[PDB]
Amino acid sequence: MLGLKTSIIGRRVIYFQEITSTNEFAKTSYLEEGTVIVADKQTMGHGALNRKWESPEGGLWLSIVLSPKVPQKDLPKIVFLGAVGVVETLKEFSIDGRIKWPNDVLVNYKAIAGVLVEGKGDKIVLGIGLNVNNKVPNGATSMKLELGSEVPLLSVFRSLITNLDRLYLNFLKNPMDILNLVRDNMILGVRVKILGDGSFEGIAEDIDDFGRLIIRLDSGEVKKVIYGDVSLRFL
Amino acid sequence: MLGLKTSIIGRRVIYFQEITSTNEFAKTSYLEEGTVIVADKQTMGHGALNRKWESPEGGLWLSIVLSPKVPQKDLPKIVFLGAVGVVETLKEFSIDGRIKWPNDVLVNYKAIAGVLVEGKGDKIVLGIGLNVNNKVPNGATSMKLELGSEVPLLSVFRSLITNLDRLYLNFLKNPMDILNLVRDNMILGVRVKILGDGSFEGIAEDIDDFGRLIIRLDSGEVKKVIYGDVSL
Numbered sequence: 001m002l003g004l005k006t007s008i009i010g011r012r013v014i015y016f017q018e019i020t021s022t023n024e025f026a027k028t029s030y031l032e033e034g035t036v037i038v039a040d041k042q043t044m045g046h047g048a049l050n051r052k053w054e055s056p057e058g059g060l061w062l063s064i065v066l067s068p069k070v071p072q073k074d075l076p077k078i079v080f081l082g083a084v085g086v087v088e089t090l091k092e093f094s095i096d097g098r099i100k101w102p103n104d105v106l107v108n109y110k111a112i113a114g115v116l117v118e119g120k121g122d123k124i125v126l127g128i129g130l131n132v133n134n135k136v137p138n139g140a141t142s143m144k145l146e147l148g149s150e151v152p153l154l155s156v157f158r159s160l161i162t163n164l165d166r167l168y169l170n171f172l173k174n175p176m177d178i179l180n181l182v183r184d185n186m187i188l189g190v191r192v193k194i195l196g197d198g199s200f201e202g203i204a205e206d207i208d209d210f211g212r213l214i215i216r217l218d219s220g221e222v223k224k225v226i227y228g229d230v231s232l233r234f235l
Numbered sequence: 236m237l238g239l240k241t242s243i244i245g246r247r248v249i250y251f252q253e254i255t256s257t258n259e260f261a262k263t264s265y266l267e268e269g270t271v272i273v274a275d276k277q278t279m280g281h282g283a284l285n286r287k288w289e290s291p292e293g294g295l296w297l298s299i300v301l302s303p304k305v306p307q308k309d310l311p312k313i314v315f316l317g318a319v320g321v322v323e324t325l326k327e328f329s330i331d332g333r334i335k336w337p338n339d340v341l342v343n344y345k346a347i348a349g350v351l352v353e354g355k356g357d358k359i360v361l362g363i364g365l366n367v368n369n370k371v372p373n374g375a376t377s378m379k380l381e382l383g384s385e386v387p388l389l390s391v392f393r394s395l396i397t398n399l400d401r402l403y404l405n406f407l408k409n410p411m412d413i414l415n416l417v418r419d420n421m422i423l424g425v426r427v428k429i430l431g432d433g434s435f436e437g438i439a440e441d442i443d444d445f446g447r448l449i450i451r452l453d454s455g456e457v458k459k460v461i462y463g464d465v466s467l
């Protein structure tokens with residue numbers, strides 16, 4: 001009854017009044033590529049390292065099952081698909097979303113959405129949490145809060161699914177294209193702190209041909225950051 | 236993201252751009268009670284027996300998984316929940332639908348919807364096909380044809396699920412209630428022909444406590460129909 005016209009993403013959609021976590025359900029269940037798992041609220045929503053992701057009613061919490069037939073070296077770029085998709089949808093609603101490498105989208109430096117990719121080769125789960133009309137934790141914001149009025153949740157869903165399907169289809173043909181879009185929509189030219197094995201500060205200059213964040217330390221030394229257990233903090 | 240507020244029916248919804256048949260999928264897949272299977276289009280939609288149910292884009296084609304902890308004798312009434320639900324939804328949209336025993340809903344005698352219940356194991360599948368904005372077979376009708384304008388398909392879905400959830404919850408507690416709701420919305424007091432072998436005609440008088448159609452033949456003899464096709 002939804003009348004979705006996408007080619008892959010959204011061929012099927014499983015909606016939940018409530019669920020533990022759409023990412024957990026998508027990873028665990030036997031599902032076809034392109035299936036979208038969406039719920040009004042999550043009781044056990046999570047980010048990386050099982051960090052808690054607040055998922056109250058009013059937000060868009062979903063996961064997409066993917067089976068990307070591209071070189072293994074391109075797989076890490078899936079997270080960018082989600083990030084850019086969100087940015088494009090926000091722009092459609094006239095909200096200025098900017099990407100915080102590699103998986104967050106901010107508005108005025110406040111987190112409005114987060115992306116989490118999990119998988120293992122043949123099966124990749126693209127998870128996206130976007131605050132629309134829901135209450136949010138400090139440090140975050142929502143579409144409603146930015147526009148000063150509530151936004152039809154279904155309209156946001158349709159917008160995002162349409163955008164992701166297009167991005168994904170092009171990704172299968174040209175896996176490098178998404179890097180240009182991330183670059184054009186990411187926060188750069190400012191000082192950032194990278195938290196990992198230790199920590200260092202520098203100017204976020206750009207992302208390279210592998211999606212690595214290029215940071216210039218005061219000393220002039222260039223470091224290339226690979227995401228995966230490293231957190232980025234703006235100063 | 237649909238924000239459904241129903242108690243059982245609609246707890247989960249599985250949507251398909253395209254599918255063979257929502258009833259078939261519901262029968263062969265493990266799904267929790269209340270799960271709704273819905274698709275924009277069915278390539279192998281079916282009615283009773285070996286009949287095809289045209290299911291092009293624009294209509295509402297869905298199936299609901301139920302597991303009624305009620306006596307065995309009440310299960311034949313599930314089809315009525317579907318039919319009454321459709322009638323109630325049609326009324327919300329200013330359309331007067333009447334039930335043609337035991338599973339069809341007609342508007343001015345043109346079929347606008349059909350219900351098909353199939354029991355599999357101890358799970359019951361309630362299938363409903365309602366013509367909204369889609370093209371229909373000659374002689375049939377749709378909500379669009381009755382109203383003269385395109386009807387928001389999702390609005391019809393929300394309305395129907397809400398009505399069905401209410402009807403079902405009450406059915407679990409008071410299984411006889413549905414019978415009177417059917418009687419007040421069914422085509423009665425008219426001559427009909429019970430098709431098939433031993434075909435016969437008579438006046439459709441009412442439905443009894445089991446949901447059987449009561450027919451009075453011209454001879455004065457009374458027959459009770461459990462199932463079959465009725466022609467007005």
Ligand SMILES: Nc1ncnc2c1ncn2[C@@H]1O[C@H](COP(=O)(O)OCCCCC[C@@H]2SC[C@@H]3NC(=O)N[C@@H]32)[C@@H](O)[C@H]1O
Pocket residue numbers: 020021022023024042044045046047048049051052053054055060061062063103111112113114115116127128129130131136137139140141
């Ligand atoms: N509602 C919120 N808005 C803004 N910030 C918040 C919110 N809830 C929690 N946070 C903050 O975000 C952090 C999680 O960040 P992350 O690990 O980068 O991981 C980010 C990835 C999140 C993916 C979320 C989706 S929801 C659909 C799917 N199901 C699921 O369980 N996860 C994904 C938390 O530690 C917290 O400080």
Ligand SMILES: Nc1ncnc2c1ncn2[C@@H]1O[C@H](COP(=O)(O)OCCCCC[C@@H]2SC[C@@H]3NC(=O)N[C@@H]32)[C@@H](O)[C@H]1O
Pocket residue numbers: 255256257258259277279280281282283284286287288289290295296297298338339346347348349350351362363364365366371372375376
């Ligand atoms: N779109 C239509 N509108 C009006 N009349 C039509 C339409 N398509 C076919 N018909 C006529 O209705 C008859 C089917 O009637 P039925 O056996 O009483 O069986 C009726 C039960 C139908 C249940 C349909 C739902 S759709 C969701 C679910 N999935 C599935 O495969 N079946 C059910 C056909 O033989 C045909 O003449």
